Amino acid sequence: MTRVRSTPGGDLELVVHLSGPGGPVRWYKDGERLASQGRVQLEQAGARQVLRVQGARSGDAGEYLCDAPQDSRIFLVSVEEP
């Protein structure tokens, strides 16, 4: 799994370099997909997918799914290190 690490109070930026195209590639969290929100800053470049959650504390930690058409990968995202 494509692992990312954050701290309780900072920002959460997930940048992928998977083997998938533009798609559109989807972002999931705890089973349910994320939409382009004021706190959820998305970017779609295919081989580079960016999910940015503003304010990584508790509910922002979890397993994400960067669902590429041919190359769907899970993110082990832990908000840790006080």
Swiss-Prot record:
Domain Ig-like residues, every copy: 2-82
Indicate where this protein resides in the cell: Cytoplasm; Cytoplasm, Cytoskeleton, Microtubule organizing center, Centrosome; Cytoplasm, Perinuclear region; Golgi apparatus
Q: Which portion of the complete protein is shown here? A: 1277 to 1357 of 1896
User: Which clinical disorder is mentioned?
Assistant: 3M syndrome 2: An autosomal recessive disorder characterized by severe pre- and postnatal growth retardation, facial dysmorphism, large head circumference, and normal intelligence and endocrine function. Skeletal changes include long slender tubular bones and tall vertebral bodies.
> Tell me, what does this protein do in biology?
Core component of the 3M complex, a complex required to regulate microtubule dynamics and genome integrity. It is unclear how the 3M complex regulates microtubules, it could act by controlling the level of a microtubule stabilizer. Acts as a regulator of the Cul7-RING(FBXW8) ubiquitin-protein ligase, playing a critical role in the ubiquitin ligase pathway that regulates Golgi morphogenesis and dendrite patterning in brain. Required to localize CUL7 to the Golgi apparatus in neurons.
Name used for this protein in its record:
Obscurin-like protein 1
Q: In which tissues is it expressed?
A: Widely expressed, with predominant levels found in the heart.
How does this protein assemble? Answer: Component of the 3M complex, composed of core components CUL7, CCDC8 and OBSL1. Interacts with CCDC8. Interacts with CUL7; the interaction is direct. Interacts with FBXW8. Interacts (via N-terminal Ig-like domain) with TTN/titin (via C-terminal Ig-like domain); the interaction is direct.
